[PDB]
Amino acid sequence: GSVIDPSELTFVQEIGSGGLVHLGYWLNKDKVAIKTIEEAEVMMKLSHPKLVQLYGVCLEQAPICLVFEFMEHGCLSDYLRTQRGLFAAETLLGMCLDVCEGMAYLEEASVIHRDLAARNCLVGENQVIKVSDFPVKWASPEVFSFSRYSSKSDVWSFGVLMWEVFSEGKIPYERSNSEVVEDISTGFRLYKPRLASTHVYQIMNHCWKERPEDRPAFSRLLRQLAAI
Numbered sequence: 001g002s003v004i005d006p007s008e009l010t011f012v013q014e015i016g017s018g019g020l021v022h023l024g025y026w027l028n029k030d031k032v033a034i035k036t037i038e039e040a041e042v043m044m045k046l047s048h049p050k051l052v053q054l055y056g057v058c059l060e061q062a063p064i065c066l067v068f069e070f071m072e073h074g075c076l077s078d079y080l081r082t083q084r085g086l087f088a089a090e091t092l093l094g095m096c097l098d099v100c101e102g103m104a105y106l107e108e109a110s111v112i113h114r115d116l117a118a119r120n121c122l123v124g125e126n127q128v129i130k131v132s133d134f135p136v137k138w139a140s141p142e143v144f145s146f147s148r149y150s151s152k153s154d155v156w157s158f159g160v161l162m163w164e165v166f167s168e169g170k171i172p173y174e175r176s177n178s179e180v181v182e183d184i185s186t187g188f189r190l191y192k193p194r195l196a197s198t199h200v201y202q203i204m205n206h207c208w209k210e211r212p213e214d215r216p217a218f219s220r221l222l223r224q225l226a227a228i
């Protein structure tokens with residue numbers, strides 16, 4: 001079921017902190033990411049090729065850990081920055097499309113990410129991007145002011161992620177939390193990255209409408225991104 005026996009796992013090496021994350025092996029054969037600290041039951045039901053898959057929970061261990069799909073190229077944020085200068089626009093679009101497909105699935109499943117950013121996406125084989133772990137610089141106005149989350153607040157975050165992707169891992173509003181709040185509150189928006197076309201930038205700006213009701217749903221964004 002949802003439970004992985006501790007003897008089925010091998011801890012190989014720490015690969016980073018989220019807390020602690022290890023590269024491991026599952027049944028001595030398969031690479032997995034082991035994340036040590038009923039929501040988990042919901043999480044396992046969330047199966048999509050553009051979502052990092054939760055394979056199971058190891059309960060008979062302290063502290064308990066979660067066993068995930070292993071993504072060999074690490075965080076999208078890191079990968080964009082290290083590979084900066086090597087990206088064609090078409091590849092960057094594909095990365096946004098990947099994320100949008102994962103997010104459309106979550107939207108349809110009534111799951112709000114709440115912290116969508118390039119740092120929370122992972123890079124796999126053939127440069128596939130998957131959404132993981134389902135922060136004012138990614139927050140919509142209604143979130144940072146009133147904690148009003150929805151798939152539409154995730155859409156705002158996705159617009160910022162699009163910007164991260166097309167700017168090859170630049171830090172958005174590279175300003176304090178108070179200053180970003182006051183920038184966004186007054187109508188300021190991230191300027192267009194060089195590699196983003198006029199068309200891509202209008203999609204971005206549609207994600208950044210002040211009102212959640214004026215932002216497109218991920219279902220609509222997916223049609224728009226696929227139509228390019």
Ligand SMILES: Cc1cc(Nc2nn(C3CCOCC3)c(=O)c3cc(CN4CCN(C)CC4)ccc23)[nH]n1
Binds near residue numbers: 018074132
């Ligand atoms: C859940 C989950 C996490 C993963 N893999 C990796 N996660 N993280 C962080 C993800 C967020 O939590 C902290 C760990 C890394 O940092 C990382 C780093 C590498 C190695 N890099 C990339 C390839 N370069 C050539 C060398 C350096 C490989 C895999 C990963 N799969 N599933």
